């Protein structure tokens, strides 16, 4: 039982600059039988170098892995545009085999304002009995963004998920959906909904509020 | 070297889970070859599951011991994957490969299938408009969502059309979330106000494609002005 | 969806060419067509459209070019304001006619 | 950071059934200035030699070789003082200068 | 350990410059000590002239040889430097500092005094009114500059104050030119398009200092409204 | 004769990355007797390594000079905001000594969208028999920039200067005066002066013109 682990987690890059990865694994390696892979969101995972010695047939010479041991650092010279996509390493000398997390990287843009749009739920879902108010959010960056529910002075929690769109090709921004489910009865008891969004860009946090069936 | 992946999509967790990894164009006869099994949840990282090698000698996970069983087959160049005690959290695409030796692993990778673990079962998705209130400052631009809930699987394609059947570019779509069991999913757009000020259309369709049901139903346009 | 408020000001008794002014504040929605007429006669030329501001309302006001002597041989200038398919009209005079 | 011009005054009042709402009925007047250059003019409204400071709204000057200049005012009035024969005054300051217009509604 | 540069400012082409470089604190008995002069023109880099060891020992450049005088004095604890066949090309700030042993060269610098070279006389500087065209587009910003011509040396600070008594921060500030001999400077400042509109001022002063005669002329403020 | 060439000329840094500035040298050094000189741009110069191999008294650690034979690099960890200066190496192993030409070093910053006021000369100035007209450029990046005159469909060369200022310590840009000097004579005979301002910034030049006699 080999457990790997990638930090961090995240890395800004930048198109044409040298990207590392690092892989770190709980114990050795027995002949450096560690293997990188290559997955693009939305096709088949490819081998790029296997043993993290000699690349494989089809591998551009622009990738270059090295490391022995614990370290393995996977260095890139001239990263294209194409290629910014999530890299595993994996090793192949454990009986059986094992993966690790994943460094996801993005292109190094300015920070923006998002321009969040909360869209109350309309009289025909609340006949079945469920609401749901959501959070939308669009052109901000990072990732990285807190959003709250401030309904009557009370923060809600563990009843609310968070989905992110990824990285656009014309935009390289991100866009999350808070939606905010409940039932017809807890919904016909408050008042004000909204929610609170916390930006870097932003120095004070902007609340868009609105009343029940009066607008 | 091309493989292809085949079964089911819609299972019931508890049951049985069945797959097939269709290969052509090789043998399991020389040494050093193996076919694997690598599953990936929507938001999560790389799985292993299990390994065979040759001479009859095939490997499991000590996390998933006694829970998987392999049977290989050299007459239909197939390998069937018997999956037992199904849990809806295990959700993942599944994915085999063939290795090239002891020092290549996993070089021909496939095409993998969707497998949704879920008690319910298929039923139309479920539209409902969204009114988007915009008061105080209007910005720039107003939006206007098409709310879509109990679906499955997640197969659908947003679509925006103008009142008098044109095409508006949609471009932002935002992925499915798991709601209890079933999925559920938001898609807006960014309409310009001077376009909604001026022209006569007072809504506009929500046009969407699944295999289980072509539902469809406009949402109204409050307007700011 | 408010009906516009026509109001078509008329130069001074004693003296001021003038400029005839056509109102219709608090009206909504904000697009807005004003025309000017002369003796039930279309215009073509000789009047201008202010850009419309904000005061939620609005403000939208026309400019009309007339002459004095034109101005007092009892001419009726009615300020026709389509809002919303419906035709405001005001039919004004001279005061001490 | 050459063309120095008079502001010309002209007040505009309504007619004999310009006057609408309910009881008492309410109307504006309407002071405009064009073909001035510069513009330091300061709208101020006079009643019978009374200043009025309640009332009145200041629209922003806006632009129709000298550069000339065009300011809108508008000022609200009641029927009941139209009808005591109360003389409204245009104030004009440009430059210093003092721009007087009594207008009023005697034939 | 200190040092400190004195002489003539004000000198004419091809007669005598004489400078000295006073230092107090230390004395030239041990080994390894010595003192040099380096000069840098307004827009080049460092150059070096020449440079005395002990036990009366200097060496002087190979490009300027049998150009300069060194004479070393051990009871005024100064050097004396001559230097003739003056060039106005020349114009540099000289420098002098002190070595502690031979691997710490030019440790304890001086602070330098401005020599200009010039034909002229020291004249009162001329101050020429600006008047500012800018038509078309007014954008955002307008500026107003202060012209200041024959003077000498450069030891003009601008400063702008309204019609009032009162201060404007200057900020930008141009360097001088050689114009012939003689030197050209030029001062804006970035003033608002509200305040100019809001006041009545007509004018505004242009007051600058000079150890030659404090000369004063207001530009024309035409203003914009 | 050693003739010091530092080559670039210029380099744009940053706040916290490392400067790496080049020292070249016609001829070897005899045991390699290169030192560093720090020069402020308005008070004297320091010493900072003499010999490059030990440090002088008050000089941070956090600069590190080596190299020998005819390659000297100086490397710097921590650029400071008060370091943006000139800097020079300088040998004392030739008989007599010699120096280089130094390399200047700026804040990188984005590039902006200068506006170029002309002035046109006064009749108080034309008095005295002769003419200038400047044209000066604020908040351009970086200093490298070219300044034609264009009067009467004419380029004219030789007979005016290029004046800039250094870089604002609240703005981190730059400023550059061009006065276009003449005769009365030759002042009279032409209606239009105008400057031509060619920057990065900008996708096409633009030309600020006026009237003889006429603003
Ligand atoms: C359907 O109606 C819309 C009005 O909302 C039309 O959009 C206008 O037409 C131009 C050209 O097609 C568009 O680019 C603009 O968005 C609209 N014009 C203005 C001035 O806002 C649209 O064209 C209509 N569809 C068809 C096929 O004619
Ligand atoms: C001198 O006159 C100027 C007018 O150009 C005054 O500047 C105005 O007053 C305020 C308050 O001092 C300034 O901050 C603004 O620049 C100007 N106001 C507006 C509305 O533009 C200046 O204050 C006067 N000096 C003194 C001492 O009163």
């Known amino acids: 039982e080999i457990v790997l682990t990638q930090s961090p987690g995240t890395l800004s890059l930048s198109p044409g600059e040298r990207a590392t990865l690092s892989c770190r694994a709980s114990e050795t390696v027995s002949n450096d039988k560690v293997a990188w892979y290559q997955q693009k969101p939305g096709q088949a995972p490819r081998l790029l170098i296997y043993?993290?010695?000699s690349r494989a047939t089809g591998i551009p010479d622009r990738f270059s892995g090295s490391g022995s041991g614990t370290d393995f650092t996977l260095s890139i010279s001239g990263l294209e545009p194409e290629d910014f996509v999530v890299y595993y390493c994996?090793?192949?000398?454990?009986?059986?085999?094992?993966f690790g997390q994943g460094t996801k990287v993005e292109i190094k843009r300015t920070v923006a304002a998002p321009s969040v749009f909360i869209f109350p739920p309309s009289d025909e879902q609340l006949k079945s009995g469920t609401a749901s108010v959501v959070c939308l959010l669009n052109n901000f960056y990072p990732r990285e963004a807190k959003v709250q529910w401030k309904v009557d002075n009370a923060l809600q929690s563990g009843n609310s998920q968070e989905s992110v769109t990824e990285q656009d090709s014309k935009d390289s921004t991100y866009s999350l959906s808070s939606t905010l489910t409940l039932s017809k009865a807890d919904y016909e008891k408050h008042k004000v909904y909204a929610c609170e969004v916390t930006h870097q860009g932003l120095s004070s946090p902007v609340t868009k509020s609105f009343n029940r069936g009066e607008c | 070297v091309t493989l292809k992946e085949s079964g089911p999509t819609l299972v019931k967790p508890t049951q049985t889970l069945t797959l097939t990894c269709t290969f052509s164009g090789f043998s399991l006869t020389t040494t050093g070859e193996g076919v694997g099994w690598i599953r990936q949840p929507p938001g999560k990282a790389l799985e292993f599951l299990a390994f065979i090698y040759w001479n009859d000698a095939k490997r499991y996970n000590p996390s998933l011991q006694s829970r998987l069983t392999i049977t290989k087959d050299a007459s239909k160049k197939q390998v069937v994957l018997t999956l037992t005690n199904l849990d809806p959290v295990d959700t993942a695409t599944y994915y085999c490969?063939?290795?090239?030796?002891?020092?290549?692993?996993?070089?021909?990778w496939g095409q993998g299938t969707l497998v949704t673990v879920s008690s319910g079962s298929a039923s139309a998705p479920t539209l409902f408009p969204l009114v988007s209130c915009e008061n105080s400052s209007p910005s720039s631009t107003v939006a206007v969502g098409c709310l879509a809930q109990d679906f499955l699987p997640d197969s659908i394609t947003f679509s925006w059309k103008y009142k008098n059947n044109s095409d508006i570019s949609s471009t932002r779509g935002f992925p499915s979330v798991l709601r209890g069991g079933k999925y559920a999913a938001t898609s807006q757009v960014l309409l310009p106000s001077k376009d909604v000020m001026q022209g006569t259309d007072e809504h506009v369709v929500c046009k969407v494609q699944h295999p289980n049901g072509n539902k469809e139903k406009d949402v109204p346009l409050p307007v700011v002005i | 969806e408010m009906n516009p408020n026509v109001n078509v000001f008329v130069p001074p008794r004693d003296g001021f060419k003038s400029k005839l002014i056509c109102e219709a504040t608090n009206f909504t929605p904000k697009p807005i067509t004003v025309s000017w007429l002369k003796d039930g006669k279309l215009v073509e030329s000789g009047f201008t459209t202010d850009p419309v501001t904000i005061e939620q309302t609005y403000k939208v006001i026309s400019t009309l070019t007339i002459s004095e002597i034109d101005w007092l041989n009892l001419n009726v200038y009615t300020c026709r304001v389509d809002h919303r398919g419906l035709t405001f009209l005001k039919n004004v005079s001279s005061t001490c006619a | 950071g050459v063309a120095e011009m008079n502001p010309n005054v002209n007040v505009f009042v309504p007619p004999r059934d310009g006057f609408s709402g309910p009881a008492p009925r309410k109307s504006k007047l309407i002071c405009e200035a064009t073909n001035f250059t510069p513009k330091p003019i300061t709208v101020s409204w006079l009643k019978d030699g009374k200043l009025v400071e309640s009332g009145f709204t200041t629209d922003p000057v806006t632009i129709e070789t000298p550069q000339t200049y065009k300011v809108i005012s508008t000022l609200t009035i009641s029927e009941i003082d139209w009808l005591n024969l109360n003389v409204y005054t245009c104030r004009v300051d440009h430059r210093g200068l003092t721009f007087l217009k009594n207008v009023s509604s005697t034939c | 350990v200190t040092l400190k540069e004195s002489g003539p400012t004000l000198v004419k082409p091809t007669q005598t410059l004489t400078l000295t470089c006073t230092f107090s604190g230390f004395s030239l008995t041990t080994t390894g000590e010595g003192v040099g002069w380096i000069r840098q023109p307004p827009g080049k880099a460092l150059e070096f002239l020449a440079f005395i060891y002990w036990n009366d020992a200097k060496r002087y450049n190979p490009s300027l040889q049998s150009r300069l005088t060194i004479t070393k004095d051990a009871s005024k604890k100064q050097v004396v430097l001559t230097l003739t066949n003056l060039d106005p090309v020349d114009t540099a700030t000289?420098?002098?500092?002190?070595?502690?042993?031979?691997?710490?060269?030019?440790?304890?610098?001086?602070?330098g005094t401005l020599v200009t070279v010039s034909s002229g006389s020291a004249s009162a500087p001329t101050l020429f009114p600006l008047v500012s065209c800018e038509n078309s587009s007014p954008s955002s910003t307008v500026a107003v500059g202060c012209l200041a011509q024959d003077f000498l040396p450069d030891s003009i600070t601008f400063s702008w104050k309204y019609k009032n008594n009162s201060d404007i921060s200057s900020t930008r500030g141009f360097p001088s030119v050689l114009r012939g001999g003689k030197y050209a400077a030029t001062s804006q400042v970035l003033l608002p398009s509200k305040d100019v509109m809001q006041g009545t001022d007509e004018h505004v002063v242009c007051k600058v200092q000079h150890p030659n005669g404090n000369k004063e002329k207001d530009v024309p403020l035409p203003v914009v409204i | 004769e050693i003739v010091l060439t530092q080559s670039p000329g210029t380099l744009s840094l940053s706040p916290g990355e490392r400067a790496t500035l080049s020292c070249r040298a016609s001829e070897t050094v005899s045991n390699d007797k290169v030192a560093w000189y720090q020069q402020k741009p308005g008070q004297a110069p320091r010493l900072?390594?003499?010999?490059?191999?030990?440090?002088?008294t008050g000089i941070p650690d956090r600069f590190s000079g080596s190299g020998s034979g005819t390659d000297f690099t100086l490397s710097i960890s921590g650029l400071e905001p008060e370091d943006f200066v000139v800097?020079?190496?300088?040998?004392?192993?030739?008989?007599?000594?010699?120096?280089?030409?130094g390399t200047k070093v700026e804040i990188k910053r984005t590039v902006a969208a200068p506006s170029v006021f002309i002035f046109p000369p006064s009749d108080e100035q034309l008095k005295s028999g002769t003419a200038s007209v400047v044209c000066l450029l604020n908040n351009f990046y970086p200093r490298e920039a070219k300044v034609q005159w264009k009067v009467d469909n004419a380029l004219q060369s030789g007979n005016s200067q290029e004046s800039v200022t250094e870089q604002d310590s609240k703005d981190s840009t730059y400023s550059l005066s061009s006065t276009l000097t003449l005769s009365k004579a030759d002042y009279e005979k032409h209606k239009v002066y105008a400057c031509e301002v060619t920057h990065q910034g900008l996708s096409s030049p633009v030309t600020k013109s006026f009237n003889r006699g006429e603003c």
């Open positions: 043993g993290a010695s």
């Open positions: 994996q090793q192949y000398a454990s009986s059986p085999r094992t």
């Open positions: 490969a063939r290795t090239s030796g002891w020092d290549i692993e996993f070089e021909y």
